[PDB]
Amino acid sequence: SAQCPHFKPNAGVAAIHDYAGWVRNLSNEAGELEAVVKQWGLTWTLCESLWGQLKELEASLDEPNEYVRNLERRKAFSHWLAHT
Amino acid sequence: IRAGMTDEAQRLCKRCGQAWRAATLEGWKLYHDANINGGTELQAVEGNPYRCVWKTC
């Protein structure tokens, strides 16, 4: 709209799955690359567990009940903690 | 237990100081979560979800 164009992230939809998908490709050759890949992996998988806030094999196939939504986040974060 | 008085057996275990054994007699309780079908009030989960492991032990 102006002679100085403006970027803005596509409003926040899929970046967690782009980042988690990207590190799930770097894992194919991460066996020998060491810089801060585990530090960034811990942070971005924590962000997925917390404000994931993404697909969970239809976490709800039908309708969400906040008790179920929060128990299912405790399952996902418990699986993260076990994997860490 | 042979008299169907499994609750009296658990009370006896607790009174004799063997509350751990009383807990081993509860592992046969059928798993039920009344909240799975979307009730208006949250009900407490019943039974043992690890029954198969308990039964194998």
Q: What portion of residues of chain A is helical?
A: 40-55%
Distance between the termini of chain B: 18 Å
**Spatial shape of chain A:** flat
Tally of separate helices of chain B: 3
Instruction: Please report the total strand number of chain A as a whole number.
Output: 0
PDB class: structural protein
Keywords: nuclear pore complex, nuclear ring, Nup205, Y complex, Elys
Entry title: Cryo-EM structure of the NR subunit from X. laevis NPC
Chain A: Nuclear pore complex protein Nup96
Describe the structure.
It is classed as structural protein. The structure is cut from a larger assembly and holds chains A (84 residues) and B (57 residues). Chain A has 84 residues and is mainly alpha-helical. Chain A has three helices and no strands. In chain A, helix 1 (15-26) packs antiparallel against helix 2 and helix 2 packs antiparallel against helix 3 (66-83). The radius of gyration of chain A is 17 Å and the shape is flat. Chain A starts with 14 loop residues before the first helix and ends with a helix. With 57 residues, chain B is mainly alpha-helical. In chain B, 39% of the residues lie in helices and 0% in strands. The longest helix of chain B has 10 residues, at 6-15. Chain B starts with 5 loop residues before the first helix and ends with a helix. The A-B interface holds A 63, 65, 67-68 and B 35, 38, 42.
Features:
part of a larger assembly; 2 chains; A: 84 residues; mainly alpha; 52% helix; 0% strand; B: 57 residues; elongated; Nuclear pore complex protein (chain B)
